[PDB]
Amino acid sequence: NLRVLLDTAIPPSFCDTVSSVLLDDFNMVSLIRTSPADSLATIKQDNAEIDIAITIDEELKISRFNQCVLGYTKAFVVAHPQHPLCNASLHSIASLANYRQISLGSRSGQHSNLLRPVSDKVLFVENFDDMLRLVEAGVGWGIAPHYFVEERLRNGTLAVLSELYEPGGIDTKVYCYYNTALESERSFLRFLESARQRLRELG
Numbered sequence: 404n405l406r407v408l409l410d411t412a413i414p415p416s417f418c419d420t421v422s423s424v425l426l427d428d429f430n431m432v433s434l435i436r437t438s439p440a441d442s443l444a445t446i447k448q449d450n451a452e453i454d455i456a457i458t459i460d461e462e463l464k465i466s467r468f469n470q471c472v473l474g475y476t477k478a479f480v481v482a483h484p485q486h487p488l489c490n491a492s493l494h495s496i497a498s499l500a501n502y503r504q505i506s507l508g509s510r511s512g513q514h515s516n517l518l519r520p521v522s523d524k525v526l527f528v529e530n531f532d533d534m535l536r537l538v539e540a541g542v543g544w545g546i547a548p549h550y551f552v553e554e555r556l557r558n559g560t561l562a563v564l565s566e567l568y569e570p571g572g573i574d575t576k577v578y579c580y581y582n583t584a585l586e587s588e589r590s591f592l593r594f595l596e597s598a599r600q601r602l603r604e605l606g
């Protein structure tokens with residue numbers, strides 16, 4: 404039995420990519436979704452017995468776990484089209500610190516440099532859905548994966564503020580944290596090679 408953790412920042416496009424591949428090699432495969440805020444918090448619980456985690460969160464070294472990079476993915480800062488900062492000026496991009504952020508909360512109550520909120524007016528949520536509800540209602544700005552915001556952005560229900568900070572949206576690394584047990588196993592290298600391909604082509 405193999406247990407695999409994918410945070411909700413990973414497109415579910417991808418979540419198909421591993422399933423075919425991993426099950427070529429392995430017999431039981433459990434897929435588990437967490438908040439990116441909870442990805443690393445979870446694997447560190449010995450009892451949770453996670454073997455692989457696909458997460459955007461970065462941490463320098465973790466016990467009993469090697470890191471590597473499967474690929475990259477875009478994220479956008481989004482707000483209500485009529486949000487004060489809709490004018491999207493480099494002045495407005497410094498002012499994020501001043502307007503209310505809808506940030507992802509974490510059970511541990513603790514956040515990495517990566518996912519820690521930026522503004523002091525913060526309101527926490529469990530998933531990117533509650534995030535965008537509140538953002539669609541002009542209650543704040545928030546930073547969400549492409550696949551969540553592509554729908555609403557074409558629909559005009561939502562606006563991007565992040566395009567002068569990083570044109571193209573914000574590339575984020577997708578990390579593979581894997582139990583050291585796996586490094587030698589031809590099983591893993593197979594999955595890794597396949598995994599990288601689909602996130603590439605999914606770009």
Ligand SMILES: CC(C)C1NC(Cn2cnc3ccc(Cl)cc3c2=O)=CS1
Nearest residue numbers: 412477478517518521546547548573575
């Ligand atoms: C404050 C922004 C200017 C930036 N914050 C980040 C970190 N960050 C935060 N949440 C995310 C949620 C989802 C995804 Cl896919 C990525 C991120 C992310 O990178 C980068 S610039």
